[PDB]
Design a protein around this ligand. Sequence first.
Ligand SMILES: O[C@@H]1[C@@H](O)[C@H](O[C@@H]2CO[C@@H](O[C@@H]3CO[C@@H](O[C@@H]4CO[C@@H](O)[C@H](O)[C@H]4O)[C@H](O)[C@H]3O)[C@H](O)[C@H]2O)OC[C@H]1O
Ligand SMILES: [Ca+2]
Ligand SMILES: [Ca+2]
Ligand code: NA
Ligand code: NA
Length: 131
Amino acid sequence: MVIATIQAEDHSQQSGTQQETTTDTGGGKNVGYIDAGDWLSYAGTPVNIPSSGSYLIEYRVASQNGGGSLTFEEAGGAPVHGTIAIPATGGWQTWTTIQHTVNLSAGSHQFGIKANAGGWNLNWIRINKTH
Ligand SMILES: O[C@@H]1[C@@H](O)[C@H](O[C@@H]2CO[C@@H](O[C@@H]3CO[C@@H](O[C@@H]4CO[C@@H](O)[C@H](O)[C@H]4O)[C@H](O)[C@H]3O)[C@H](O)[C@H]2O)OC[C@H]1O
Ligand SMILES: [Ca+2]
Ligand SMILES: [Ca+2]
Ligand code: NA
Ligand code: NA
């Protein structure tokens, strides 16, 4: 069951990135020009987690050459929830969905993403129940 879909471009604050038009399914925009140090805050749109436990986080990503990684966290940087490697997809607008699990406490969260290594674009993020 889906808890939230967050379009990557709908950040309340950011550093070092730029929006661009995406040709991915559904159109709209993606965040691009993501490099080490860059970040996206979704603190403006808190998401409610109904119960403590495991959640599946999905990211809609594109990467010409691979090598990227990100850290999913609360905005401001702590606690950190998890990290994920972003694979090469064949190009900047060739999209795939990647995923990992993290533990989240129940209640209102203000999420953020920190790029540890660049080379990827982000269309949206999705938070899902597991159990
Ligand atoms: O006396 C009564 C007033 O208190 C009441 O005012 C309402 C109070 O609630 C207001 O909504 C608030 C707005 O802030 C939200 O938290 C933010 C969530 O995003 C975060 O990024 C940010 O940092 C937080 O500050 C909070 O959840 C929400 O409840 C509302 O706008 C006011 O109208 O009005 C009725 C009076 O009788
Ligand atoms: Ca950048
Ligand atoms: Ca988008
Ligand atoms: Na492409
Ligand atoms: Na980089």
